[PDB]
């Protein structure tokens, strides 16, 4: 388990502020310092289970 600790190195995670979801499949979002991005979701979540005003690991 402590061997995959290199994982921490993989990269980082971007919290984000969802502006709202739409059609075509891709959540519309404004991260934080930067601004709005419309971007795909994780496969493990719906588009529908995604509401407006909520944090999510990008």
């Amino acid at each position: 388990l402590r061997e995959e600790l290199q994982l921490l190195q993989e990269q980082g995670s971007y919290v984000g502020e969802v502006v709202r979801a739409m059609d075509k499949k891709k959540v519309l979002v404004k991260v934080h310092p930067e601004g709005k991005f419309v971007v795909d979701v994780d496969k493990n979540i719906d588009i529908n289970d995604v509401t407006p005003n909520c944090r999510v690991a990008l």
Binding site: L28, K30, G35, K36, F37, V38, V39, D40
Partner: protein
């Protein structure tokens, strides 16, 4: 018989409609973009399917659209789909549900009805005919080379029924109902009386034919709110704004206009003049008959003691409007609910009359 042939025809049309290489091409169109892309705002534009954009972080790149969707679909100063590479325009966007259209855009029914306003008529036919009419049956004006009654004005004391009318129409109307108050037309930020007016009018023009309604247009003058600036050399413009927007250049189109003021002595003539506001309607304060319809209407939808006589109340107050009468109707309700009594009595209305009117 041909109806069947007609129906299946309609059906076959549905199939071909639904019936709408390409997959790759579509994926090519997906592949072309980037996952994920980047929001960014329009600035200038050029026939080179590229202009300079605008960003919060404010990189402004020159970039093409990924072209099937269009540049002319959009205007300068508008957020567009950009890659993260060059911020390449990847396509248009949809000006998300702003917070203007919402507020100003009464969707659900307005309640009431054109057979709820006891004691009116000529006032009614005047408004309806001038506005509601040309909206429903607009086929006459198309022959008499006339148009519709531009704007309309409602005035009179406090409780004549001006808001009812705005409420009645909306009840059986069919056009976007923009309910903007002038009092709100007075914010605490310089040069903001002309944004609100533009946004309300701009929002009205977009939703296509609609009813812009301004209740208490007087409040735009007969009032000087602390938190403001300029004091009154600002409100004036805001008037000027209203006067200009509610009026000339461009070509307003189907924005009908409804103003609800109590005192018409404090309106700039520029707003009253015709063109801007033609039909000028008054709301008299009942009398002895209208009130009967008003009283009967307000006490007819409840367990009103069939003993008492709405008359006593009608001949009671001196010049009570269509409100005071309603308050008495309601007063009994609380009286009724007070001493726990399904049906009200005499005093209940009495206490009401003396509880509301007098006090």
């Amino acid at each position: 018989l041909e109806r069947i042939k007609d129906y299946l025809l309609m059906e076959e049309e549905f199939i071909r409609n639904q019936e709408q290489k390409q997959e790759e091409e579509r994926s090519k169109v997906d592949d072309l973009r980037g996952t994920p892309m980047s929001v960014g705002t329009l600035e200038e534009i050029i026939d080179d399917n590229h202009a300079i954009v605008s960003t919060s972080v404010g990189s402004e790149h020159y970039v093409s659209i990924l072209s099937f969707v269009d540049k002319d679909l959009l205007e300068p100063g508008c957020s567009v789909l950009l890659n993260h590479k060059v911020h390449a325009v990847i396509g248009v966007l949809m000006d998300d549900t702003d917070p203007l259209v919402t507020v100003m855009k009464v969707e659900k029914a307005p309640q009431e009805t054109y057979a709820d306003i006891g004691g009116l008529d000529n006032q009614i036919q005047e408004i309806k005919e001038s506005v509601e009419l040309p909206l429903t049956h607009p086929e006459y004006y198309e022959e008499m080379g006339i148009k519709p009654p531009k704007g309309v004005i409602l005035y009179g004391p406090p409780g004549t029924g001006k808001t009812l009318l705005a409420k009645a129409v909306a009840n059986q109307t069919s056009a976007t109902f923009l309910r903007v108050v002038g009092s709100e037309l007075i914010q605490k930020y310089l040069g903001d009386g002309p944004k609100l007016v533009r946004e309300l009018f701009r929002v009205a023009e977009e939703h296509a034919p609609s009813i812009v309604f301004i209740d208490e247009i007087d409040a735009i003058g007969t009032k000087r709110y602390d938190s403001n600036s300029g004091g009154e050399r600002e409100i004036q413009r805001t008037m000027l704004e209203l006067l200009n927007q509610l009026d000339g250049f461009d070509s307003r189109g189907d924005v009908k206009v409804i103003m609800a003021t109590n005192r018409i002595e404090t309106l700039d003539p520029a707003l009253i003049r015709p063109g801007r506001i033609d039909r000028k309607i008054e709301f008299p304060l009942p009398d002895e008959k209208t009130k009967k319809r008003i009283f009967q209407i307000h006490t007819s939808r409840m367990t009103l003691a069939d003993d008492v006589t709405l008359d006593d109340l009608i001949m009671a107050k001196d010049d009570l409007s269509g409100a005071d009468i309603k308050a008495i109707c309601t007063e009994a309700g609380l009286m009724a609910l007070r001493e726990r009594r399904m049906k009200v009595t005499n005093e209940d209305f009495k206490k009401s009359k003396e509880n509301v009117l007098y006090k």
